[PDB]
């Protein structure tokens with residue numbers, strides 16, 4: 001309950017993950033990739049044949065979901081039912097399925113405790129959509145990392161090409177656009193910056209610049 005927390009909310013592909021890892025390292029604080037949980041759940045639904053369009057069927061899945069995260073030894077390691085799925089949850093599908101699953105209010109609430117349990121001394125950087133607005137309301141440090149949707153798409157495309165996957169800009173743009181709209185239009189706990197959240201727009205800023213500003217702001221408020 002009583003422990004500092006830095007929330008980093010923002011749309012898809014805004015670089016929250018990186019920014020979260022970089023700050024966790026610079027502060028030797030714990031990390032929480034909330035998206036990973038939603039993605040893990042969606043992967044459980046697929047394996048256990050649970051209808052992703054059914055709130056009733058997802059709830060029992062959510063409350064009894066056996067997940068597990070291991071310390072970022074250079075990377076994150078997601079474990080479902082004792083099986084490293086770290087790569088499988090990083091596909092487009094799952095990502096689409098996590099959005100879908102994420103829309104049901106009853107589901108989110110059934111996951112509330114698991115996320116809040118990451119709040120431990122000395123600190124916790126929390127990456128998600130509603131960390132600063134629902135999950136940890138009283139966070140002393142709230143950042144809303146964002147960009148234009150065109151930029152985030154270009155970055156995503158360039159990242160895919162690095163790994164050698166075919167790409168299309170138009171398509172990718174429509175992929176995230178849909179994703180955000182869903183997470184933004186959602187009647188319960190939608191994407192939206194907390195009033196006291198610092199809006200970080202990284203459109204023209206390099207990666208180091210983002211970290212630089214994020215850390216400057218954090219250290220200031222946390223003394």
Ligand SMILES: Nc1ccn([C@H]2C[C@H](O)[C@@H](COP(=O)(O)O)O2)c(=O)n1
Pocket residue numbers: 012013034035036038039095098099102127128129130131179183
């Ligand atoms: N705190 C969060 C994190 C994620 N999501 C949902 C909407 C995102 O589309 C999806 C995957 O998020 P991420 O790409 O950050 O893994 O899960 C959410 O509703 N709340």
